Amino acid sequence: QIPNRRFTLWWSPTINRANVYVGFQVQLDL
Amino acid sequence: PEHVRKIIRDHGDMTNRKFRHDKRVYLGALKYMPHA
Amino acid sequence: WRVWLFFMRGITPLLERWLGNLLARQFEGRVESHFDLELRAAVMHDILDMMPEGIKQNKARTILQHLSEAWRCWKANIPWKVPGLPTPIENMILRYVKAKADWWTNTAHYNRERIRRGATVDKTVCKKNLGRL
Amino acid sequence: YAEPAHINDFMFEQQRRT
Amino acid sequence: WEDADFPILCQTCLGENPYIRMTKEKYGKECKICARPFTVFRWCPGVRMRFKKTEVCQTCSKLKNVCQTCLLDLEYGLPIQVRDAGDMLLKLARTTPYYKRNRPHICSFWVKGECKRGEECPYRHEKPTDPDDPLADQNIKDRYYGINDPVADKLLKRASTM
Amino acid sequence: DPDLQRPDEEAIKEITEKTRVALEKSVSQKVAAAYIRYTPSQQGVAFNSGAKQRVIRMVEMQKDPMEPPRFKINKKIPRGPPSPPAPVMHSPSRKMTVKEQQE
Amino acid sequence: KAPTMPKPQWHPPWKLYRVISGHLGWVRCIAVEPGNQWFVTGSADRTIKIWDLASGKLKLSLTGHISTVRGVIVSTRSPYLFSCGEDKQVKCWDLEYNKVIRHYHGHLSAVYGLDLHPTIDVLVTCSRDSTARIWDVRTKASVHTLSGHTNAVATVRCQAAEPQIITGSHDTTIRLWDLVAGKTRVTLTNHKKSVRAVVLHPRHYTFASGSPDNIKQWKFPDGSFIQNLSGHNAIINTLTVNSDGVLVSGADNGTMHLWDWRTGYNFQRVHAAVQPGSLDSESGIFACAFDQSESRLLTAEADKTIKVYREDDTATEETH
RNA sequence: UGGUUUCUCUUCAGAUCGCAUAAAUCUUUCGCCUUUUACUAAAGAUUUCCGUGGAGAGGAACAACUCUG
RNA sequence: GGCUAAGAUC
RNA sequence: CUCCGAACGGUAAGAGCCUAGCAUGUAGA
């Protein structure tokens, strides 16, 4: 899970946007 | 005759006009809807 | 108008079964191991019926353990049988072992015929089909 | 102990109420 | 589940006439004696009566041996707390029952003064009972079970008066 | 011929007609879900005297044929968990032989 | 010295005419078509295959079960070759399209046997979970759960003469559960072994019964023990009886003892052979039923060979 | 011989019963496939629904206009 | 106490 | 060339306090 965590965090603006996932408004915390 | 115009007039009253003990049968008998 | 009148003509028998249970819950309130268990329970049913010579200190799980050690000895293709036993008890044990060998060989050839492409999905059946062959 | 009868309900309800 | 064929009721609740009429509703009315649906048997006791129905369950009333509507007893008429106390049932019993067991309910519009129904009012336009007495403070299991029975308490207390 | 007699074909057809009517009543009950006079011998002595038959008409109330059920699944006990335990009386069980443990 | 000893019944011995061996595994059920043309017989390969009743050649192969096919009841009142599989599924394979048409369910374990009633439109599926099941034909629903057995209900009998349904329980107690009520009207004070066999001779007498150890006859009205069986101590699994007075008993040891339904003495009592590919002690008659023409007997052995036994005329077989 | 209608209930329907035509289920097939239902349509047979056909039973309207013979 | 690939196993 | 898809696999996890649109229609004296 450790190399999977570094790869998912590196492409965080590419893998988490409005075009890549359409219907979503989830906020994490404050 | 014009009897159906009076019965459907009492729709959402506060248990005093066709709503005391008939609201359970009103949503259950209407579950045969698409045949109508 | 003709197509959508037939749409409700097909949904009127449907929706009484679709939304029939939905209006009812508001007032009513809502593998191969089975063949191994059925062969094991029928073996105990046959051993308790096919001549136990009455109530004369009859068999137990050790007789089923004798059938278990006979299948494990045949599984490695070893010539080790189960010697030192009565002849009808050994014949009843060898009959269920020859029938279980027919089930396991047919289950091996069925998975191998679907091993080329078959289903394009195999989680633990790939290790079992390679071990059986 | 139940014991039904095959009498008419119309004549029985009329005679008892009279 | 829970079916029935004939109501096990008393002769007082059956009506003051040899001929009556019953109405059977199979698996309904939610009988609170066993929390199971029973055959609700409605009937008419007579002219100007209450026209009540069955309240207790069928199998739940068999162990108690009481009426289906009055739920007092089978032969004597004392409550279940008075029947399980003790013949004691011979002296506490009373034949020729009162019409208050078959009397209808009171008119709430007559208690409020605005009784607009008039002489055709099926309810009784009389004075209600005194709420200070424990006789109008019973419950479901308080009348069925012998625990906390106000009617059985006064029946054993008034039996030794003289 | 009287000891090994066979039943009549009309009696078999009458048993078949009664079984077909009983199975149709159970099938109509499965597809739906998925006067009288009792003599008051309990306390009838003097209260409302003269009631020798106590006739009560059994009029089934026609319920609405479009409704949810009036209660939930019934959690009441329908019957008794004791049985009529009929005895076996098949054969006297005894020991076979002294060599039965060796055979 | 014995009663009715010097006047027995007439029974000429039989002879095997053809041993068809096409299945792959132990055959557990065998049945003949009422038109004497088809011969339905299951196997352990989960495939109920029909063959010619007279020619013996293969006619069809119908699979679909997920376990051993331990029951094949070809319906004579309707074209539907219903079958009982051990995978908790009474697959009613209708022969109108050679496919499953009903696929009824409800049993919690394997089904032992199935019998179609001649009068009532229902199928008595003797399951093995805890009881049998009265499945309604062309309704896909059960009628009543005749729970009157302390073990698996192996045998089943649906007679028009008997008002109840004769169920054969493996708890050494046969029962006659009524069709309308469901409770056992009368038990059986015999069959000390696990009773897994039943027969019926409606030609000139009442329906009999059977047992592996100490078998005995019975009667259709409320049961009546007429006489016990001969010296057959093996585990009997097949019990057929013809209208000519023959009584065939198929045991698991391979000793196919044939006796008389009236005399009771074993006429032939011959033992069959085995397949060359099979083991030494593997031949056992698991299912046996006579033909529709009552000429050639058919017994499905456990050695993967459906053997057919024809008749033969002889006279030097007098019993003392 | 003697009745045009209308509404209730009892069977079989092998007639394009329907001069037009829905849904679900079961057994086999294809396409996507990523967990599943909603999926695409080729074959066959099982229900439900929209409906209907002859022939006895009970009410209402002029059954009396006198219909065929 | 059964079936699972001496169940794979230093 | 004009054949247009919907849901689940998703927002957590908890502590103290605060306010609400709901339901039953009884036998008894």
Beta carbons of G284 and G302 less than 8 angstroms apart: yes
Beta carbons of G214 and G190 less than 8 angstroms apart: yes
Q: Which nucleotides of H are covered by protein (CB under 7 A)?
A: 21-24, 26-28, 33, 35, 44-50
CA angle G31, G34, G35 (to 5 degrees): 120
- C-alpha torsion F65→F68→F72→F77, nearest 10: 10
Task: State residue A2 phi and psi, 5-degree precision.
Answer: -70, -45
Q: Are strands E19-31 and F55-60 parallel, antiparallel or unpaired?
A: parallel
| DSSP codes, G131-196 | S-EEEETTTTEE-------SS-EEEEE--SSSSEEEEEESSS--EEEESSS-SEEEE-S---S---
Task: State residue G177 phi and psi, 5-degree precision.
Answer: -85, 130
Bridge partners (DSSP) listed for residue G115 = G124
Q: Which value in Å is the resolution of this experimental model?
A: 4.2
3-state secondary structure of C130: helix
Select from B21, B23, B25, B35 the residue whose CB has the most chain F CBs within 10 Å, as the one to mutate to test that interface.
B25
Q: Give the start-end residues of each E strand in G21-174.
A: 30-32, 38-41, 47-52, 58-63, 69-74, 81-85, 92-94, 99-100, 111-116, 122-127, 133-136, 141-142, 153-157, 164-169
DSSP B29: G
Task: State residue E158 phi and psi, 5-degree precision.
Answer: -80, -10
- Cα–Cα distance between F7 and G206 in angstroms, integer? 10
Instruction: Test B34 with C8 for CB contact under 8 angstroms.
Output: yes
Residue nearest to nucleotide H20 (CA to C1'): C2
- Helices C125-132 and C87-113 sit at what angle, rounded to 10 degrees? 120
Q: Are strands F36-37 and G306-311 parallel, antiparallel or unpaired?
A: unpaired
Interface residues, strand I, Cβ cutoff 7 Å: C 33, 36-37, 40, 61, 64-65, 68, 71-72, 75-76, 124, 127-128, 131-132
User: b/e string for E76-101 if b means 16 or more Cβ within 10 A?
Assistant: bbbbbbbbebeeebeebeeeebeeeb
Find where tokens 């069809």 sit.
G60
Residue B33's Cβ-side half-sphere holds a number of Cα atoms within 13 Å equal to 10
3-state secondary structure of C6: helix
Instruction: Test G189 with F89 for CB contact under 8 angstroms.
Output: yes
Give the CA-to-C1' distance from A1 to I6 in angstroms: 35
Beta carbons of E2 and E27 less than 8 angstroms apart: yes
Tell me which chain C residue has its CA closest to the CA of residue B29: C23
- Cα–Cα distance between G297 and G240 in angstroms, integer? 10
Beta carbons of G167 and G156 less than 8 angstroms apart: yes
- Cα–Cα distance between E22 and E40 in angstroms, integer? 10
Give the CA-to-C1' distance from C3 to J8 in angstroms: 31
Residues of B in contact with C19 (CB under 8 A): 31
- Enumerate residues 1 to 18 of chain D having a beta carbon within 8 A of any beta carbon in chain E: 2, 12-13, 16
Task: State residue B25 phi and psi, 5-degree precision.
Answer: -80, -20
Give the CA-to-C1' distance from G96 to H53 in angstroms: 28
Q: Counting one residue from B and one from C, how many pairs have CB atoms under 8 Å apart?
A: 16
Beta carbons of G254 and G236 less than 8 angstroms apart: no
Please give the method by which this entry was determined.
cryo-EM
Q: Examine chains C and F and say if they touch (3+ CB pairs below 8 A).
A: yes
Instruction: Test G160 with F16 for CB contact under 8 angstroms.
Output: yes
Tell me how close the Cα of F54 comes to any Cα of chain E, in angstroms: 5
Tell whether C51 lies on the interface with G, counting CB pairs under 8 A. Answer: yes
**Token code pair at residue E101:** 């067991």
In chain C, % helix, strand, coil (3-state, to 5) comes to 60, 0, 40
- Cα–Cα distance between G40 and C28 in angstroms, integer? 46
Q: What H or E segment, with its residue span, contains residue E25?
A: strand E19-31
Give the CA-to-C1' distance from C110 to J14 in angstroms: 54
Give the CA-to-C1' distance from E99 to J22 in angstroms: 39
- Cα–Cα distance between G8 and G105 in angstroms, integer? 48
Tell whether E96 lies on the interface with F, counting CB pairs under 8 A. Answer: yes
Number of H helices, E strands in chain A: 2, 0
Tell whether E89 lies on the interface with F, counting CB pairs under 8 A. Answer: no
User: b/e string for C94-113 if b means 16 or more Cβ within 10 A?
Assistant: bbbbbbbebbbeeeeeebee
Report how far Cα E6 is from the mean position of its chain's Cα atoms: 18
Beta carbons of G112 and G70 less than 8 angstroms apart: yes
